Design a protein around this ligand. Structure first.
Ligand code: HEM
Ligand code: HEM
Lengths: 385, 392
């Protein structure tokens, strides 16, 4: 495993939460940057990251160093089978029917919020929504969602390591009978979709489906909670006028969501192992070289995004950011995350006329380590009707 | 505002700086264009990149507040919109005619030095040939009277030959004595045009303008600083390579004397370290693969780009038969290309031919330590002495 912390070498939690100064330095002085201590190549330009992520002919996901069942360590010469099987659960049809179910879960969370005093938007919406939503789309029976939610909070929400292997044991032992039941009772959920999915005649087995669900929870529960929490932090400490714009016209939420993914999702970075000699990045890369594509950095590249260090929900090409990746490994749950963010934002802005930060908030005292870097543990705010 | 290049390299021994082959490898492979935060400089190591920086005057200027060194008279800090006048005036002294007439005069000086070397006994080719030859040669082409060359040689040894505090006052006294001595000579030569560099600088005219007596003396001081020490360095490194690199090279040169030009050109590619010139960015561009803004300083490492496998096949090995050895960038590129390049090539060839023609073989000395015989210089580290045994 690659210790990415040595490449950045931050000396504070708040800097890692929004590494805007490091992004500037690396975009300006080290577009392609070899790090001697980790033996890794680091790319920050939009064109460079797009090459690394998309061009599978030269950059492989299968590699010793990392930062039909596991489609994240496989390349297109075999990736299509696992990709197509998993894509059958995320068709435009399923996404269309998930809007009222996700919208309904968000109503309970927003209707529960009353002002009176300061609220914690992380515990009240940012953290519970992805967990409650993914339990719904999995088809977990309603009477077990509490226990399911508890496992997900231990696994993917920030001795601790022994508590996690007991959660993994309980998860696999509980969900395997569920997958067996659903094969004889096809409902309208993801597990039922993974069962009947067929590619090249092959299908998933019961044991393979349980692993796949564990891959989806790890891929779109914490990252979605992070994006929702950062969206509210930006609505509080970045552009003050943005909230009033969203409430004047609710139709601007999709643009606001897409701009939060470009500007306020840190940090985004995936590795690729070089499979063929080339100088496609401006340096001579040999086979076996590890290249880290920094996407949260390339979303600030002025060669692609005009005025990149400012928030602008009217920038016409905000959707071409690389927070969801590029190429064959493009995020399969990207439309779901976009729907979750829009619904959580729409339902919130429709209720409250204005929001205001809290007096004594210190960013450094409310951050914890996470997969992307640093995540808000809580986010106090005052809300008004 | 001079740039301390030592912080970019940050060597931990003199021997590494004398032949930084491992550092070149890392930078060619991992940092082709390398921004250094402590000096705020861009560093280029690729052959194609260095050729852009050195040659493309439209974007890279020699006139710049920051320089890596320390009108019509100093043509090295000026750009083509004005560089042409000083260049042409100085070029009138280095025509193909003068170079042809300098061969017998340089050949005679090398004979004086080689017959003096004497047969058996270990010799120091730095004291015996590498150091004295460029000083004696440049005095001849300057037209310095024969009875005054001894004092002239001493001034050059203090100013441009490496070796507590007395040095800085000893050097400013040498420059003072130099300018006071040479000004009457230039006045005399205006009425006695001979066949030397000072006579050519007198009769030189560009755009109708000419040099004045005070301006010509400045120019001669620029030539001594530009082609006396660097040439001594190249000759000394050639003999070090003949001793510790390719053992078979000396016997090959003696079988066929016509290979000396190839040997000379390969020593300039392989064993001249370190070469580096600065350029200040005059226009926003991405011609090197990075976003360069106006006012940025770019250092073109030429001794490094001579090891670029994209241009020279098998670049880390000595090969005097490589067909493109002459495309190295040790003499620069573009409008500021070294004006004394044919002279330096002639001096190296003549010093090498005259030596191998006399001695059948050379052998290094038992207890030579490279680290104990190096001193600081303009290019990095220079040999103070180099013992060798000569035979036949
Ligand atoms: C803010 C939310 C999200 C972000 C930033 C995000 C980010 C990413 C990125 C960058 C990739 C590509 C990795 C690479 O190219 O190597 C990816 C892949 C993937 N994502 Fe997401 N994701 C999010 C939400 C979700 C959700 C809600 C799901 C729901 C299932 C999901 C499931 C997946 C899967 C299965 C893959 C692997 C697809 C493949 O490798 O072919 N993600 N994600
Ligand atoms: C091994 C021998 C030599 C080497 C490596 C060498 C190297 C160089 C280089 C690289 C430049 C260009 C620097 C730039 O682009 O800014 C230069 C310029 C110059 N050199 Fe040499 N040189 C050598 C010998 C000589 C000799 C023997 C003379 C005799 C007068 C000489 C006189 C000059 C002059 C006048 C310039 C100015 C050219 C201009 O600015 O247009 N050099 N030298």
């Amino acid at each position: 495993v690659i210790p990415v912390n040595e490449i950045t070498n931050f000396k504070s939690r708040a800097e890692e939460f929004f590494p805007i100064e490091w992004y500037k330095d690396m975009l300006h002085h080290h577009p392609v940057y070899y790090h001697e201590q980790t033996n890794t190549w680091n790319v920050f330009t939009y064109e460079g990251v797009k090459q690394v992520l998309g061009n599978y002919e030269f950059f492989s996901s299968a590699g010793p160093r990392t930062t039909l069942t596991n489609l994240t360590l496989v390349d297109p010469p075999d990736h299509r089978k696992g990709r197509s099987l998993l894509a059958a659960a995320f068709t435009p049809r399923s996404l269309k029917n998930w809007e009222p179910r996700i919208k309904q879960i968000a109503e309970e969370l927003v209707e529960n919020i009353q002002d009176n005093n300061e609220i914690n938007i992380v515990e009240a919406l940012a953290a519970p929504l992805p967990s409650m939503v993914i339990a719904d789309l999995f088809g977990v029976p309603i009477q077990d969602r509490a226990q399911f939610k508890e496992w997900v909070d231990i696994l993917f929400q920030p001795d601790i390591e022994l508590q996690k292997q007991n959660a993994a044991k309980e998860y696999f032992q509980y969900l395997y009978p569920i997958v067996v039941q659903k094969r004889s009772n096809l409902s309208d959920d993801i597990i039922s979709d993974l069962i009947q999915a067929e590619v090249d005649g092959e299908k998933f087995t019961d044991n393979e489906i349980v692993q796949v669900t564990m891959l989806l929870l790890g891929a779109g529960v914490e990252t979605t909670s992070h994006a929702i929490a950062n969206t509210f932090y930006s609505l509080l400490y970045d552009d003050e006028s943005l909230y009033g714009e969203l409430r004047n016209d609710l139709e601007l939420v999709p643009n606001a969501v897409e701009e939060m993914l470009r500007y306020r999702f840190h940090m985004s970075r995936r590795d690729r192992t070089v499979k063929k000699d080339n100088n496609l990045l401006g340096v001579e890369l040999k086979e076996g070289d590890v290249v880290i594509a920094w996407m949260s950095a390339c979303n600030m590249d002025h060669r692609m995004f005009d005025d990149p260090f400012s928030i602008n929900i009217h920038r016409p090409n905000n959707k071409k950011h690389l927070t969801f990746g590029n190429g064959p490994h493009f995020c399969l749950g990207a439309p779901l995350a976009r729907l979750e963010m829009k619904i959580a934002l729409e339902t919130f802005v429709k209720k409250f006329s204005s929001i205001e930060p809290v007096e004594g908030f210190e960013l450094e005292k409310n951050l914890t380590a996470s997969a992307t870097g640093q995540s808000l543990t809580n986010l106090p705010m005052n809300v008004y009707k």
